[PDB]
UniProtKB/TrEMBL annotation:
InterPro entries: Dipep/tripep_permease, MFS_dom, MFS_trans_sf, MFS_Transporters, POT_fam, PTR2_symporter_CS
Record's protein name: Di-/tripeptide transporter
Family: Belongs to the major facilitator superfamily. Proton-dependent oligopeptide transporter (POT/PTR) (TC 2.A.17) family.
Every Major facilitator superfamily (MFS) profile domain range: 1-191
Record bears the keyword Transcription regulation: no
Membrane topology, record value: Multi-pass membrane protein
Species classification: Bacteria, Bacillati, Bacillota, Bacilli, Lactobacillales
Subcellular location(s) of the protein: Cell membrane; Membrane
Domain of life of the source: Bacteria
Keywords, sorted A to Z: Cell membrane, Membrane, Transmembrane, Transmembrane helix, Transport
Binding sites annotated in the UniProt record for L-glutamine: R16, Y20, K116, S384
Function of the molecule: Proton-dependent uptake of di- or tri-peptides.
């Protein structure tokens, strides 16, 4: 392959290492912060923070593509996105409390928004239009993402149990630092100079007005919230949820139908991502509260997701050699992954603790579902943003008392809507 893939492989390997490493202990960290009185929220609110955090990272991602192509360039977008992210982890390793969560979260949200769509763009830039190495090349790139995502919970989770949260977060910072270094020294060797600048720059003033109007409305909204007395943390989370959902909602005989025909497909994607992103929130809660797991860090369950991706990837590749049907069966598997998790609780009760194989099977199903499910790329991140945004409301409903009903009701609900969608194909 081109020498430049090595640089980008490790760069992405290390950014996702940093991201999912942080994600694997962050909910437990907030639980920790609550118990010590630094964070005055319920565990439900802490869970809600995890969901909207992921959600905003995805939402943030739909703009960075715009910013790179038109303003700062894909390569500077990646570097400075990475710098902000590295700063995001640095903020969390300091002996601060809630004041660092948010500062960190904002840094990482913005930083990841810059990096994710743009590293993917640069991967494309390695190849000519007709260069055949492309499918293989993108596959190798994706393996690095999963590999980093796989090893990260293992390493950071172990550090957390052994040496505490702060040390664990510092490993994530070092991981991102390594990525920036490799990206930087490797980039000057192999990456095309063209992407140091924007490819599609009288539009500068209007863009300023457009961004400003969205932000000005947003700040005024926060003011009014504080005036009506809807200025609690859950209230602010409600604002971000509404924003994340309104963006897609606001967005002839035959023609009109096609655009309309896509609506059920988008909802399927949203609902799948809702379920898939709950892996790092609700199942993490289930793992820590309902499972017998003394010989390894419970955060390690988060490694099962990319493991199954790596395990599934070569099989489906052989297999494929319609799309709405893929969405449908994919959503059904997501529903099945939750229906499955309802079984141990219903049979034995929720007061005791159960075997780890239930979570293995759940992830087995949802990633199975995942194997089935420039313009379309941002649409992909909104599917996940809205899904995670949807999660920000639902996960506050999860506790030991609601465990079985939560998995079953919403599980069957997903299967049924999947049944509605298969039919519409």
């Amino acid at each position: 392959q081109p020498l430049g893939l090595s640089t980008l492989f490790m760069t992405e390997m290390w950014e996702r290492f940093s991201y999912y490493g942080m994600r694997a202990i962050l909910l437990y960290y907030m639980w920790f912060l609550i118990s010590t009185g630094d964070l005055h929220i319920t565990r439900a609110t802490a869970a809600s923070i995890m969901a909207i955090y992921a959600s905003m990272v995805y939402l943030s991602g739909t703009i960075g593509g715009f910013v790179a192509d038109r303003i700062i360039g894909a390569r500077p977008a990646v570097f400075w996105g990475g710098v902000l992210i590295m700063l995001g982890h640095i903020v969390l390793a300091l002996p601060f409390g809630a004041s660092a969560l948010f500062g960190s979260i904002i840094l990482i949200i913005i930083g990841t928004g810059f990096l994710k769509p743009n590293v993917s763009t640069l991967v494309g830039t390695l190849y000519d239009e007709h260069d055949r190495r492309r499918d293989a090349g993108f596959s190798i790139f994706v393996f690095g993402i999963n590999l980093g995502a796989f090893i990260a919970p293992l390493i950071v989770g172990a550090a957390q149990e052994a040496a505490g949260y702060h040390v664990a977060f510092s490993l994530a910072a070092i991981g991102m630092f390594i990525g920036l270094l490799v990206y930087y020294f490797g980039g000057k060797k192999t990456l095309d100079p063209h992407y140091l600048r924007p490819t599609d720059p009288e539009e500068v003033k209007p863009l300023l007005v457009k961004v400003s109007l969205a932000v000005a409305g947003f700040i005024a909204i926060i003011v009014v919230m504080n005036l009506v007395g809807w200025n609690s943390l859950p209230a602010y989370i409600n604002l971000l949820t509404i924003v994340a959902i309104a963006i897609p909602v606001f967005y002839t005989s035959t023609e009109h139908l096609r655009v309309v025909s896509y609506i059920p497909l988008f909802i399927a994607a949203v609902l799948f991502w809702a379920i898939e992103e709950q892996g790092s929130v609700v199942l993490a809660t289930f793992a820590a509260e309902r499972v017998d797991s003394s010989w390894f860090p419970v955060s390690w369950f988060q490694s099962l997701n990319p493991l199954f991706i790596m395990l599934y990837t070569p099989f489906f590749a052989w297999l494929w050699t319609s799309s709405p049907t893929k969405f449908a069966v994919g959503l059904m598997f997501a529903g099945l992954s939750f229906l499955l998790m309802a079984i141990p609780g219903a049979l034995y009760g929720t007061s005791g603790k159960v075997s780890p194989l239930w979570l293995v099977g759940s992830w087995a199903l949802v990633i199975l579902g995942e194997m089935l499910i420039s313009q379309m790329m941002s649409m992909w991140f909104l599917s996940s943003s809205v899904g995670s945004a949807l999660n920000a409301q639902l996960v506050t409903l999860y506790n030991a008392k609601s465990e079985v009903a939560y998995f079953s009701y919403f599980g069957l609900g997903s299967v049924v809507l999947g049944i509605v969608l298969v039919f519409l194909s």
